[PDB]
Amino acid sequence: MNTVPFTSAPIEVTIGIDQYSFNVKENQPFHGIKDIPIGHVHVIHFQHADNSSMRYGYWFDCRMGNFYIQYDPKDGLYKMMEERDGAKFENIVHNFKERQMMVSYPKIDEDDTWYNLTEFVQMDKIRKIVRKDENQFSYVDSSMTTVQENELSDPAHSLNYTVINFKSREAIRPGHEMEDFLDKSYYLNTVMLQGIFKNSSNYFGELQFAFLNAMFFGNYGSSLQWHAMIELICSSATVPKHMLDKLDEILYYQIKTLPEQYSDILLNERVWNICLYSSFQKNSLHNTEKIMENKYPELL
Amino acid sequence: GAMNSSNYAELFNNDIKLFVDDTNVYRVTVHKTFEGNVATKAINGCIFTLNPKTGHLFLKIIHTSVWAGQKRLSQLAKWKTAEEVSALVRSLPKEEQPKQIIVTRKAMLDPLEVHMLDFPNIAIRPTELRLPFSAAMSIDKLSDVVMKATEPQMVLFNIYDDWLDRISSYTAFSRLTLLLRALKTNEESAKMILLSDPTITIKSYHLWPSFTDEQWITIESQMRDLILTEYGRKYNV
């Protein structure tokens, strides 16, 4: 188990840690989250009581350092920082636990939800998408734009998701225009898997990260990337059988975890009807089809 | 964006643009098999690529052989149209390449766009208009060269004959579409109107009769009357 202490909580805020969240009152004595499971990435996020616009937060991995939260009143947000003094850190953590001012990462033991949502997400790949190499953790928020969006403005603060574009030279071999546009298999398997992602676990990790950013921050370009990466698989006639079975699990847990009231803006009608009913893979997402039908039959 | 009655006049500016109509690319007759099932038999077709400002028509004849052994032909026809339009663009000197291509059917957007990826500065555009270019095959000389073709072939025409020696491109296109509209709504009456008088002939290098200005006024009036007549009949109005 690891701990992320908080210097203070000066302003009323809803704090999230992975899929969990708590309400914290202005200058309430709150000094962190404990019992956080080592072994996966995590995200701690924030929504100030006074500005329901902008959700923001930090992706991190306890294995890569001792991380804590401090409110910055000039910039007006909770900031994650790294403590290099291993001793000073255990000392703050121990003293705060003794005084019982920390909330416990509330994992139900049966629950594999977070693992299922983050199976393929790696901190090293996140830091490539959110480039800020002076920190071991990565900041994301509601407004950040993606690289592809900027092509249609500040590069430092952008989400460098891998660019997918169905009407591009990269997606279409000259002479196989119709074949490659109806059957995206060569784009998925040669260009994207073998070429850029190297393997499906990185593709999956980026797909999953894009979903979580869409879900926790309502990041619109992240939702776009998630849907593109699903569509590319569903629109390929020829996919490794192991990718199909693992995609069905991945989507199942994403659809299951989604807040019911956000299904309108977070789920693209066209993609999902194509994946589930028209695409080559209509019959290959049994668990995702079943949960989508019983929980969101309106969208279809 | 899409082309409608507002931005009609853009057609006649000096930006090169082509209309593409694919309605006549994949043409079949439907008949009964010996066992009583239904089968299709393909006949020769054509892409109707038209510069509305100059009247130049690039009539790409589509030979039934193209369909030989292929499935989902109606979908394939769209991709073949785009391949041929792309090859026509590539075949033209740069200064003759269109700055826009307007497709008469929205289904042609994705195939053309994919085929034109090598020409990113050529805008592919749909239209809201209801253009009557499917009736090109009611023009006898166009129907004849298409049906006689034994091999893929490109035939060039000016669909305005010599009209532009005397009228503007706005006017020529309005005459063309009136004539085609009429031919679409009641071909037999439209053709009767054009050919009633045997002393007004079609030049060998033309498609339409050599009407004087005054005879064109009468013709256009008769075509309008035909169209309104057929409209009252369709809707009992």
Tell me about this structure.
Chain A: One of its GO terms (biological process) is spliceosomal snRNP assembly. Chain A: Its main location: cytoplasm. Chain A: The modification Phosphoserine is found at residue 236. The complex is a heterodimer of chains A (300) and B (237). With 300 residues, chain A is an alpha+beta fold. Helices cover 41% and strands 17% of the residues of chain A. Chain A contains twelve helices and ten strands. Chain A has helices spanning 86-98, 113-118, 123-129, 147-151, 177-182, 185-197, 200-217, 220-234, 241-257, 263-266, 269-278, 286-295, and strands at residues 2-5, 13-17, 20-24, 32-36, 42-48, 56-60, 66-72, 77-83, 103-104, 138-141. In chain A, the strands form three sheets. In chain A, strands 3-2-5-6-10 form a five-stranded antiparallel β-sheet, with helices on one face. Chain A has a three-stranded mixed β-sheet with strand order 1-4-9, with helices on one face. In chain A, strand 5 (42-48) and strand 6 (56-60) form a beta hairpin. The relative contact order of chain A is 0.10. Chain B has 237 residues and is an alpha/beta fold. Chain B has six helices and eight strands. Chain B has helices at 73-91, 109-115, 140-148, 169-185, 187-195, 213-235, and strands at 17-21, 27-32, 38-43, 45-50, 56-62, 100-103, 123-125, 153-158. In chain B, the strands form two sheets. A six-stranded mixed β-sheet of chain B has the order 7-6-1-4-5-8, with helices on both faces. Chain B is globular, with a radius of gyration of 19 Å. The A-B interface holds A 167-169, 172, 177-178, 181 and B 76, 79, 82-83, 110-111, 113-115, 117.
What does the main sheet of chain B amount to? 6 strands, mixed
Q: Radius of gyration of chain A, rounded?
A: 20 Å
Number of helices of chain B: 6
Number of domains of chain B: 2
Estimated structural class of chain A = alpha+beta
Highlighted features:
heterodimer; A: 300 residues; alpha+beta; Substrate Binding Domain Of DNAk, Chain A, domain 1; Serine Threonine Protein Phosphatase 5, Tetratricopeptide repeat; 2 domains; five-stranded antiparallel β-sheet; three-stranded mixed β-sheet; 10 strands; B: 237 residues; alpha/beta; Nucleotidyltransferase, domain 5; Acyl-CoA Binding Protein; six-stranded mixed β-sheet; 6 helices
